[PDB]
Subunit: 599 residues, 3 copies
């Protein structure tokens, strides 16, 4: 029984000490080691070859120990490994095997969860180098990778990227690359103090399902001019999403390169999150080059109930093609978001927009197939000095987008730069229930509120309603002569428009088209015949051959006569109405009319 | 001290080994067994009568062991039992006592939580039989059952129903029947691989409170033609709800029988979820037969921010009565949802709808009391071939429903089949801010976009606004002669309507009613008197005794004369206006007019 | 080796029993005590000075033991202390040191989380006294307090305030005072059975960040007439919020004093929650006295997707000033909420409102700077008897608020009491897409639906659209003569208005202003000249010098003549139009017209 003492102090000691839960006679007779075996931590693998525990710290590379933990638990069919609180665990080398191709540090495995309670930091070994901290691929070539299933990272802990800048723009950096990922998630974790490309990526070219980021924080993850691009969470598998997250950047470079979320496959969502200091809110794009796993269509895309202060564009819609695949984007909803462009000089960052219809990465504007988008019940505000702010910058072909019950307070409502791209536009619908704010009133000299710089516009509705005066603007809406316009409805409500010289402008007289339905205010000079009694008044100009009716928006300050209340036209392009001369005499008046065509 | 060795290897050994937390002198001097007693797992009860641990597996019935665990922890005032990861735990027999009446396997108890990390599977013993895996009732008769309080099921684990079909349609199958359930929840769990009636039910005929399903997954839970009906989560207690869940079906039968969520009591919600492959999204119904615990009214019902691909109806509203109780439904909000009918043949599944006002289970349409419903900021799409798709199928009495700022792209906006039910309709409001999509343009031969096949319509608003042409439709809106119409506003905007032969149709000339307020386009033939100068034009037809004013929607291609810009009527039903003959002569013209009555 | 037995039974025994995880030869050789040291509970500190464990209960004050636990774990860099299930832990004395100034019981520390699984109760020592159960300040003076970081309270447990009433109204009571709090949260916990001021407060006069309350329950937390005021969660730091919570009160006093949530700093939110029995839903206010930590502006404020039954006001907007600081409120969104005033007598609780623009605490109405607010896609209902119910009670200066696509069913749409405050109103926008319900129809004798009792109104839009008749109302909208009105648009749709004697009323003839744009129905008497043929009709009254056009809303029951379809005016204030006498004769008619000015 020296033997006994010896057994007890050995590593098998706890397997010799009996235990029965709460002294319950119906409970299993076990050994202490069995109960301790119900949980597992990094401390169970963070040892030297003699089995002595090693303390973590800035001069200890914890990577091989965490790997051994994950490998072992994997072997038993899964479990959760805790990364203990009250310690910082440094990683100091790359991983080996399948994740080496991805610059991987740690390889994730199916059914093995990590509960990160303490902090994981990157050591300076990784300064100026690429890295992907957690990698769910098992092969250098992702196309020959197996899947990562049922892997969850959660807890109150922290992944800190050590503040190192990128060494070259062509490098990639990631926190969690889940890979071909099914039922994987990240919950509760703070990712901070980096220059990276993404914090988390979900899926790989459409392969994956049911991947989620929830209640995480992403802080200061861009810090250098070297960083080519950033999207904090990249969602590349369907039935996946980001909710209730917090995203914050403080670097100037983030204002030009960083986006909070990229949704790239069907049935994906971005909800309930707060963003500050980023260039962009979310990309919603079907890339043909990423369509292998879930088809060529991004549909059922939701961006809802977010709060953002950004410097560029809130939501960016896109689709593109490759030699063998064509991407399509449809069935999108953007709702309940409250968004503002932060304080900045005009033109000092990418052009401010709530919605951008962007060209593809090669700058092409004639590849897109975006339709059935609903933008509703959102608020948007840009400070008065930011010339480059729009409800929508429509810079590439659009096959449909519907706006209802939004409140836009920025420089333009609809915009595209002239002499850039000439988008083909179908089914753009701007309902009268969109409220146009007044922050930019008096700033619009030389500018058109809806600046329709497109190749063509068809099956579209623009119902302009102002809610305060802005007599600085050139017009409420303007179509250049190069824009064709057909089968559309364009109206300008008269409220706050009485002193405007131009309300709607059709530089190619496009409002005359057979299936164009318009109404807008204009000032018209009329002259009557001399006849006492019922008497016609006629416009002095002959520009009104397209008008179906017109009615007065002016009071009559005369006693001895009245001009017609309503007008029709004549073949020569004059307006004509019947007024009344109590006393005879040729009359001459200037009257503000509502001009109507087919409405 | 042989005695000592003996004690140590006994089940009481760990109660003899001292422990003090982190060697802290101010900490409690305890024994190892005390610390191990702070947690509990199934392994502590999964033993034979000699106390030897039994390994789970396909030929071990784990049921009695889990029951013993729950019973014991219950006895101590609660706790959380872990079901360990890396194992599959099979259930192989029914439970006994109070849950036998409910085909129960395991009986839940108050304050005893289950942390399901591994997998629970059903053994073939249950093939072709009913079952309810977890049951919170303590009595065969639910009316004499006590309550289940503070019971939470959570973790990353799985409940797998083993793929067995129902044996007969009259059978029921459930995952979690919480019973008369207060402060109970299911979080994180995957329910899969079944033919069941429900995965989870919350409450019992209104008794319960604060029950929630969050972040769960429900996959492939209908698989046979035998299954009579399915609702994945049935919410039958108030102050309860489903959020951020995922629901997926792949069976053809699911497309005809399955609904994701049923909300059956007040202050219930269904939010932030994704649905694919189901017939229906949510039932929102006050059943009089289920009104004992929380009253006869379902109010404060929320369906928001969901994503769905379904084959039948997205939200189904209802209420019914019994001999002693009348159910009422009011104060409902349906918002922010993006929903589509999946690819399918017309008529191949239940009639496609965003909203359905359904008859009761016996098919009665004259019992319902549904009002104060708001449907707003939703998107809906059905593929062009699906004739059987509507924004709303109004098949039973309706006391109110309001639509604002939605985007509906399907075959019908408002529909009910003729010669079926004749609903009595009050307070149906279709605001002008609803955008009508164009996917079904050219498919509407013989059909009315708003097909008002009701007994009567009162206090209703239908403001039709098209956003593209569809000249295939018979009319935009049609009331048959059997539909009474009063104290209502019906308008058709002229945009895209110029070539339509019929815009609004009142087969019983209902637009003449004293408190009917209408406007719509029509083509009218007029003839003038020969008089030079101001001259009247009169309609050749006498169908316009109800018109209060009309105005031109046509240009005047003549020089020598103009027709009136505006018209009123005369007792004989002619229109009359004053135009102008520059030169005398009887004129005859066909003009497109906006007809107005009291607007 | 008596020595060995002795060591083993000592507190260091477990540090002598070897363990190696799952017998894995590559795992660390540790001792049992090392694995037990990975977790910590209250039981590790709940002992007498001899180290004997003390059982909790009503006659044990657990406070010093919990404090020792938190202090010790703090010393190691953090961790999570469990408060065990199956026990109730009573607190019975105040804490000492820095939290004594705040009436603190327990002092929270950074990185130390509490997992509350059992119940924490207050002992009667605290009856009639102030208390703040958990306090994150480390100093009596909060301005000299350090921060509380990374502190999370979570679990399925309960904080029960023991039902004690306040002893005096000047006392404060709190559950969790996080203090200057950064990355702190409360999840899953039930707070119940009290008379307190707040359950949880986040931040201190703007200092803090990333504080959240989620999935908590707050039940019956006001119970006496002594309680001065209550806000269940007070959010006083930015980037912070409340989601998916449940709030319930049953006391009469709660209906007059209690609010569920107070949002007091920028980038804060209140979402997805259910409220019942409270006076108020949420305060959204920038208090100048609380602007030290995060600036003078509350912006990015979100209240969305809540469900509420309240007795007073749902959302209350405010801002105020101090001698050195001016508070501002802007960029607010209120969306998707479904709210009702519970059953109560008129005037029996604070005035019912969806939105209230409230004066400051000293009652001043001329300090506020509230603008860029969007209220959209909400539902509101008050029972027909509650005279004191409004969509918005506008009781203090307003610099902007926009309403779109809401459904309001209550007594008033816009209200302020006369002869109280005279608010200055700018940029109030009431879009036509707001649906006005009919519950209060026939109850509005002597009342104006939009009762514009303000000093002035500018840059505002009120588009009234009824959806049923209410001939009991005095008018749809009324401006008293003391209200100036300019640069505004005020319209009343004619639907359901044909029998109204007054539609819009301008008691000071304000609709004549140069930049006022109006339209509304009126009945007008006209008389014609005797001339056969085209013939003028003139109004008998001369009140129409402001009218720019008018058109008929009446049918013509005559054969021998027709009145004009449209009218203009003359300098003397008569209307004039040209009709037609088939046969000559002076005509005299009463016609319902739409009067238009500049629209
Ligand atoms: Na759309
Ligand atoms: Na062109
Ligand atoms: Na309604
Ligand atoms: Na009928
Ligand atoms: Na606004
Ligand atoms: Na005044």
């Amino acid at each position: 029984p020296d033997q006994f003492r010896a057994i007890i102090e050995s590593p098998e000691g706890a397997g010799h000490v009996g235990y029965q839960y709460r002294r319950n006679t119906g409970s299993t007779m076990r050994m202490v080691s069995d109960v301790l075996d119900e949980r597992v931590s990094l401390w169970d693998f963070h040892c030297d070859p003699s089995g002595n525990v090693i303390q973590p710290g800035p001069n200890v590379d914890s990577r091989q120990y965490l790997q051994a933990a994950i490998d072992y638990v994997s072997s038993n069919g899964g479990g959760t490994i805790t990364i203990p609180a009250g310690y910082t665990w440094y990683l100091g080398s790359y991983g080996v095997g399948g994740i080496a191709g991805h610059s991987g540090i740690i390889q994730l495995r199916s059914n093995v969860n990590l509960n990160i309670e303490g902090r994981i930091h990157l050591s300076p070994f990784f300064d100026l180098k690429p890295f992907q901290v957690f990698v769910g691929f098992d092969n250098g070539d992702p196309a020959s990778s197996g899947n990562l299933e049922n892997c969850h990272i959660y807890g109150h802990g922290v992944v800190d990227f050590g503040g190192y800048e990128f060494g070259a723009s062509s490098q990639l950096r990631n926190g969690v690359a889940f890979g071909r990922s099914y039922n994987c998630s990240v919950t509760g974790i703070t990712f901070q103090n980096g220059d990276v490309t993404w914090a988390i990526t979900l899926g790989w070219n459409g392969y994956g399902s049911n991947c989620y980021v929830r209640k995480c924080r992403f802080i200061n993850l861009v810090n250098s001019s070297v960083n080519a691009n950033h999207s904090t969470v990249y969602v590349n598998c369907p039935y996946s999403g980001v909710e209730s997250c917090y995203f914050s950047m403080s670097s100037s470079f983030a204002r030009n390169i960083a986006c909070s979320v990229a949704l790239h496959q069907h049935d994906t969502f971005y909800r309930g999150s707060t963003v500050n200091g980023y260039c962009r809110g979310a990309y919603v794009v079907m890339h043909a080059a990423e369509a292998a796993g879930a088809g060529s269509y991004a549909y059922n895309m939701q961006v809802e109930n977010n709060i953002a202060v950004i410097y560029g564009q809130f939501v960016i819609l896109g689709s593109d093609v490759t030699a063998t695949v064509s991407g399509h984007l449809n069935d999108v909803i953007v709702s309940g978001n409250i968004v503002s462009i932060g304080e900045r000089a005009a033109f000092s960052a990418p052009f401010g927009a709530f919605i951008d219809i962007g060209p593809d990465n090669s700058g092409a504007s004639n590849v897109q197939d975006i339709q059935r988008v609903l933008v509703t019940g959102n608020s948007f505000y840009a400070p008065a000095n930011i010339t480059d702010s729009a409800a929508i910058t429509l810079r590439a072909n659009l096959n449909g987008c519907t706006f209802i019950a939004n409140n836009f307070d920025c420089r333009y409502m609809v915009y595209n730069a002239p002499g850039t791209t000439s988008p083909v536009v179908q089914n753009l619908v701007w309902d009268k229930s969109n409220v146009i704010g007044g922050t930019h009133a008096n700033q619009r000299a030389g500018q058109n509120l809806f600046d329709m710089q497109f190749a063509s516009v068809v099956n579209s509705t623009i119902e302009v309603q102002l809610s305060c005066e802005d007599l600085s603007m050139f017009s409420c809406i303007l179509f250049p002569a190069s824009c064709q316009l057909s089968y559309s409805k364009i109206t300008v409500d008269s409220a706050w428009t009485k002193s405007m010289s131009n309300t709607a402008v059709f530089e190619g007289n496009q409002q005359a088209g057979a299936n164009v339905y318009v109404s807008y205010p204009a000032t018209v000079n009329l002259t009557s015949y001399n006849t006492q009694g019922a008497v016609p008044f006629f416009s002095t100009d002959t520009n009104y051959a397209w008008v179906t009716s017109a009615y007065s928006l002016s009071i009559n300050e005369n006693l001895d006569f009245s001009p017609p209340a309503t007008y029709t036209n004549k073949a020569n392009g004059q307006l004509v109405g019947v007024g009344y001369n109590e006393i005879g005499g040729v009359r001459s008046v200037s009257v503000r009319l509502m001009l109507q065509r087919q409405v």
